[PDB]
Symmetry: C3
Subunit: 429 residues, 3 copies
């Protein structure tokens, strides 16, 4: 919609802002059911296709016994725990029969379970009605039985190669018409209904299908859908690249890299920080993330982009000497960390080189630039529309005396480096 991006020459980092949040805060668990039947050449094909039915039920029975930079700081939880709790209820006596009763006259029904969870239950395939009413005979019957048995066969195979938990949720587990109607009857706000409906493919990837139970001639599996409790708050993506001195002797050079790269989103007076930005999915200017992949930081962490030396937040950096050249493709441009004898250029679609990077950390916007070359690596830039702003600044690495600079600090900060410099300075005195 309106994406902007600022590059900070002083800290060799860039922030892409203008995005809107869609953060997964809750789960909606629904129970999907398939009603099963206990049981010339046109008849031989029927028994062969019926053996597929009996082998799929055996697999599901034999599968039901299988009960369901700063990223290392993250917590540890189970993503499907709320879906497992619903599945544990279905194993209670008379609970599957409660679902079987509510879907007797209709396909969509809201069922309140014995543990108080009111789930929205679906009957998506009626194979007991088909197989039992067409059990009288034992080519038109052969083809239509393969079409109705196909969904059961594919649901079973997806569960077989995924321990009974699949993500993203396929059209076999839940069709678009079923998912769209499930969203409409879902007890959520109108903003969440419009968001999930306009992005059903993202909803599928952040959803789970959990194989549950097959008893009393009923196959039931749990589809666990994301609930976005945070919508339309500001998000911004922080890109970082190593910032080194560019002296002629490489042994006297020191480096510094901001380690707080990832996705940031405003959330409930704090900031939700996703250190491994691969765990978020971007749709135009909407970013979908799971709060399980996040750290909760003070909102003052944003100040590191403006003044990395601010007294309100201890900005995190590393000081590993990384004297090799690399590039980071941002949202609207490219950061280039060019060091040593590496050839660092930016080229245009048809004409070739239009910018030659010198040693140090620099930036080029994607306007009129299509590729970036660093050594023998060719990078294509993102061609999304948006404005880039180059914030000139003295590289902060030039403020440090190399003789007392603490190199090889893995997870440090501005204050930690300041503290270690004083100790070394004390030894000098």
């Amino acid at each position: 919609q309106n994406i902007t991006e600022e590059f900070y020459q002083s800290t060799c980092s860039a922030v892409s802002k203008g995005y809107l949040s869609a953060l997964r805060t809750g789960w909606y668990t629904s129970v999907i059911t398939i009603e099963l039947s206990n049981i010339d050449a046109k008849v031989k094909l029927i028994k062969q296709e019926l053996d597929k039915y009996k082998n799929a039920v055996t697999e599901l029975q034999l599968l039901m016994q299988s009960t369901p930079f700063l990223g290392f700081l993250l917590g540890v939880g189970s993503a499907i725990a709320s879906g497992v709790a619903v599945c544990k209820v279905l194993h209670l006596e008379g609970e599957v029969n409660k679902i079987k009763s509510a879907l007797l006259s209709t396909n969509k029904a809201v069922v309140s379970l014995s543990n108080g969870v009111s789930v929205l239950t679906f009957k998506v395939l009626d194979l007991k009605n088909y197989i039992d009413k067409q059990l009288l005979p034992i080519i038109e019957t052969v083809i239509e039985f393969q079409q109705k048995n196909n969904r059961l066969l594919e649901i079973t195979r997806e569960f077989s190669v995924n321990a009974g938990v699949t993500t993203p949720v396929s059209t076999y587990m839940l069709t678009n018409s079923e998912l769209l109607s499930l969203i409409n009857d879902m007890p959520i706000t109108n903003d969440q209904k419009k968001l999930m409906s306009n992005n059903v493919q993202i909803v599928r990837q952040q959803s789970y299908s959990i194989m549950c139970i097959i008893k009393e001639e009923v196959l039931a599996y749990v589809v666990q859908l994301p609930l976005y409790g945070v919508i339309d708050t500001p998000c911004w993506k922080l890109h970082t690249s190593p910032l080194c001195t560019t002296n002629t002797k490489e042994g006297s050079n020191i480096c510094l890299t901001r380690t707080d790269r990832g996705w940031y989103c405003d959330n409930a007076g704090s900031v939700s920080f996703f250190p491994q930005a691969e765990t978020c999915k971007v749709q135009s200017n909407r970013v979908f993330c799971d709060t399980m992949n996040s750290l909760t930081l003070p909102s003052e962490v944003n100040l590191c982009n403006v003044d990395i030396f601010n007294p309100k937040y201890d900005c995190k950096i590393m000081t590993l000497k990384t004297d090799v050249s690399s590039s980071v493709i941002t949202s609207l441009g490219a950061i280039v960390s060019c060091y040593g004898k590496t050839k660092c250029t930016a080229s245009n679609k048809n004409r070739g080189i239009i910018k030659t990077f010198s040693n140090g950390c620099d930036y080029v916007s994607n306007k009129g630039v299509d590729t970036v070359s660093v050594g023998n690596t060719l990078y294509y830039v993102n061609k999304q529309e948006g404005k880039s702003l180059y914030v000139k600044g003295e590289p902060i690495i030039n403020f440090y005396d190399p003789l007392v600079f603490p190199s090889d600090e893995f997870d440090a900060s501005i204050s930690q480096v300041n503290e270690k410099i004083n100790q070394s300075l004390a030894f000098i005195r």
Copy 2:
């Protein structure tokens, strides 16, 4: 069984014990074969479906030319080497003919290869017999040929998008009736037969299907199954979380995290340590692991849970400054590392917040607890039955003088930190 769990307040860690081992120590390689045939509307549908057959054989021929926290300490090996060694033998002249001979009158046959490996060979589809007997014509025949060609096409498609090696092994590569009979005829003990048969889904997940050879009208691929040479020894899971001081100035705070978290299992007088606990699969109270993902440690490593300062094992720790809050969901509870201004609570579904964590490292059991909230993240606890024991203790981080404490140590130990403190204390004097 009876899962118990101890939380150690002194080192911010918890051990879940009561599990039984099932460690992959060996491989069983079997050769799966499909006998192939060399080569109006009822005739046009056949020839287009015959083009699918010729395109799958071409694909498999074109695929046969494709010859088959502490986790960074692990070794490097090839998981499929034992299956590849069998596949290299099948390319010798007359070796495929021996298998074709032993499967001439039956589907199950044990063949001793030219390298001395007595493999259990299967003929799972006799497609040469079908195409040759129904080669006379050149609608009932069209449908039965789609059913007869379906398994060959799906085996080819799984190999095409997996470089000829698939895991888990699908029901197309090996059906349940074939897998169960393969287990029964497998030269193993009755205890291992019952374990694999009661856990076929885990066996599939820890198995490989290796595309091998397609010559002399025979398609042959190797299914490599796990052998659990370590069964029913004690296992326990170690959870760790950062332990920091809680002084009023955040710059004067120091942290410490046990780095030895993961799965531990007794094995042959030593302990098999799996540093990335994601590489193990837990079924009720049995834990399935592959010894390739393990380090072999002295059994005295258990002493770190009772006395982290013991003289018999140098317990491993890190000292990265962790000013962030997080939680670890254990087997019977939750560890909460709460620092700064973060809201850290444990709530009940209907009763609300029942524990408010203060700054530091603490623990809550799952008894009466449903969720744990740390900042903007909600964690669900396991509702598994079991007793938790809270071992009160002074957090060991309080024993260290912050002025000589070595922060930012990535892979340290109790002795290494003591050594750097002595050196720094020596420099001062």
Copy 3:
């Protein structure tokens, strides 16, 4: 060719040389199109099979709205950025019509887009021609009309299913997205050199794995997706694989021991006067003696980095090392043997199938060739060695860790080098020496 391997006892590392390069340096974007149609008991099967057609089109419209050791030193890029840029062009007005017009008389056609990118457009399935000619029934003469519609609709349903469970980006590219006959002709009509044509054709399975299929657009009754194929700008240059393992002292007190590991392990290939270094060797795929890598997973280093295997103390390149104390035993299975780092009380052996244990590794770092060796055991872990034919050379040498004073040796250095360790030792030695 001839795979050889040298083990350097001094640095606990081994180099496997004799490989030939096939490096992904660029991307080629092609546009694959499917022409679509805007629309008794045997009549129920057709419309039920026709509901699958409209449900696949609904998915694709609803999917088109979703527009897409030293490895931490690597850069960060978008792998499909070049294909997304081509797809962004197809969303322009009248751009699909240029493709729709150019594919009117043929299936293979080169189309010049409005921004000058000359893409190679392909039409692989004509479903508008079939549905329009068989639109008369909408009552059906025979069942054969149902079966041929299941056969003609099968590829569209499977392309949609692969896109549905992959956000519209699939890799490797399946035979549904592009068949072998289509890929081989796409390779032949691809404007590349004859060496690159022969390389891709004899290795189509690798080409599929290093390719992307990007769902793009559904407009004007045309389904179009972009298949992004690898361009191998570096072929047949020498490559070599470097294996490393921890090198520690074996003193009687386990607390007085220090360790050192070469961190520059990975794949190396000569490339344009420099060396392309792939620190995570899992990102390369080896076919016999040819190695396929992506330059996006590489660093461009001076060629003097090779000197670290012969003289780790050379003045021309600062060889990279770590000094984390790794008091555990481990093994690395190389191309023609095995490196074993054995420490403490661990049992470390190499055995034969029939002859038994033939080498027992002692504390420290050692190496055994695959000649007569079938397995390597370290503790409770069994590793199988490569049975490939080739010569191993054991380069005797004093382990360099014995050259360091343990009392001033800087342990727990995550990403250091020979000079960085020397500089930290001097500072500690200077403080001691001034006293």
